[PDB]
Design a protein around this ligand. Structure first.
Ligand SMILES: O=C(NCCc1ccncc1)c1ccccc1F
Length: 460
């Protein structure tokens, strides 16, 4: 029975509005409704992994797991295994997988982050799950961010707190936050970003939605504009939105948007918005293809519609050789030539690098670089040909070309990371000097760049 090199992943996000679901929710898992929908010919094909994020979820874990498992068994005739379930308040994440994957899944982690302080601490935040699927690390975040059209900067702050403090994946990757710990990271939820148009334009917006003309609405979507201005979700992807706004509906129909201010809303308007989203970030040159992104039309118990997204995701096998794991493969090496970091910092400490990868027995510390002043004010840290030769555990090119090197640049004075990035070993050539590049981030914000050349020696 061969190990897969691709799997499909279902991501669902649904703000349930504190109401129990209707009896049938299969359209959600089938990716049927509005937007980029799944072909009918695939309906009986199970996804490998189903990740379900809810917000305002009124159910117990047991109650929701029974509904989800029943739903999937009715669609696929497969009894899914529960990988993980984690709840913070009324924010929940469930991960289900086909039974054949039970012995491919390991290192399961869960965590939550509570956002805000005092007044603003007690219902918003995030839950997450991570695990290994054979040689591939997968992370999943379900966040419920701050509500309200005039709180976009609070949402951006909520995002940065969640990616700083959510403790998932390999704790040995100590310089790295969740935006660097996984081959594939999916981040979804009621992100609560709104269409920023005047209140007076509510009926005009509704008109546009009825005509399926989303362009003049999407150009005002706060998440798209904040992402274009590099305020949030830097280096994440989102499929094009081709479904109507998923909030705020009158319950028990989808015929009406309920936008007007009420005591129940704190006298706030809720103009139709794409609150409910799925984004992802995968390591460079790993296969990831969105195959659906849409909303259901037939699940109407909440003031939000459920959102679905599905992905093809490249995965690798748990590689064994005669040598590694448990020794090096002297036939393998990674060399960095002519490397330098450009940093936005005003500080003047010496810096060193750390190289982290599951292709190394443990992380590698460089010598300090040589600081120069850049033309336009910047700090340039030169490593030249000084970087330590990296010794992978396995030299087979079928393994090594699929790996990645995480890089942290750290202050000699504080040992704190000033920037983190990732280099793919999926090179055009081996035994050949080739350009490499990553942006560097810290707390998910841009802090610099790392560029140079690589020379990769494999057993071939
Ligand atoms: O017909 C259904 N599921 C049978 C699954 C099946 C699997 C493999 N080969 C043939 C058929 C069904 C689908 C959606 C909703 C409700 C249903 F009852």
């Amino acid at each position: 029975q061969p190990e897969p090199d691709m799997i499909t992943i279902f991501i669902g996000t649904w703000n349930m509005g504190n109401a129990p679901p209707p009896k049938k929710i299969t359209s959600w898992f089938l990716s049927k409704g509005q937007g980029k929908t799944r072909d009918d010919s695939a309906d009986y094909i199970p996804h490998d992994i189903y990740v379900i994020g809810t917000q305002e979820d009124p159910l117990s874990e047991k109650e929701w797991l029974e509904i989800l498992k029943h739903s999937l068994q009715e669609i696929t005739s497969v009894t899914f295994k529960t990988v993980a379930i984690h709840t913070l308040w009324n924010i929940r994440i469930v991960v289900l997988a086909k039974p054949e994957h039970e012995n491919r899944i390991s290192h399961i982690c869960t965590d939550n982050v509570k956002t805000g302080i005092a007044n603003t601490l007690g219902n918003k935040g995030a839950v997450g799950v991570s695990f290994m699927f054979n040689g591939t690390s997968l992370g999943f975040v379900n966040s419920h961010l701050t509500s309200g059209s005039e709180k976009k900067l609070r949402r951006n702050q909520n995002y940065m707190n969640i990616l700083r403090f959510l403790a998932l994946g390999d704790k040995k990757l100590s310089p790295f936050n969740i935006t660097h710990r996984f081959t594939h990271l999916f981040w979804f939820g009621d992100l609560n970003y709104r269409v920023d148009l005047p209140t007076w334009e509510a009926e005009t917006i509704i008109q546009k939605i009825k005509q399926q003309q989303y362009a003049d609405l999407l150009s005002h979507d706060q998440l798209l504009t904040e992402r274009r201005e590099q305020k949030v979700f830097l280096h994440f992807e989102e499929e094009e939105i081709t479904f109507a706004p998923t909030y705020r509906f009158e319950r028990l129909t989808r015929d009406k948007y309920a936008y007007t201010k009420q005591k129940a809303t704190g006298m706030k308007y809720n103009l139709p918005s794409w609150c409910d989203r799925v984004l992802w970030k995968s390591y460079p040159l790993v296969h990831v293809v969105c195959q659906s992104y849409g909303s259901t039309s037939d699940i109407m118990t909440s003031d939000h519609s459920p959102v679905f997204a599905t992905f093809e995701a490249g995965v690798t096998s748990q590689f064994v050789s005669k040598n590694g794991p448990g020794t090096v493969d002297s036939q393998g090496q990674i060399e960095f030539l002519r490397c330098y970091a450009t940093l936005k910092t005003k500080s003047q400490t010496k810096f060193y690098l750390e190289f982290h990868s599951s292709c190394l027995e443990s992380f590698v510390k460089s010598q300090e670089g040589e600081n120069e002043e850049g033309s336009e004010g910047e700090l340039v840290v030169k490593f030249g040909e000084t970087l330590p030769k990296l010794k992978p555990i396995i030299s087979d090119p079928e393994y090594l070309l699929d790996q990645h090197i995480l890089i942290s640049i750290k202050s000699s004075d504080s040992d704190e990371s000033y920037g983190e990035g990732c280099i793919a070993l999926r090179l055009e050539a081996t035994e050949t000097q080739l350009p490499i590049y990553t942006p560097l981030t810290h707390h998910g914000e841009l802090t610099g760049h790392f560029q140079g050349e690589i020379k990769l020696q494999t057993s071939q």
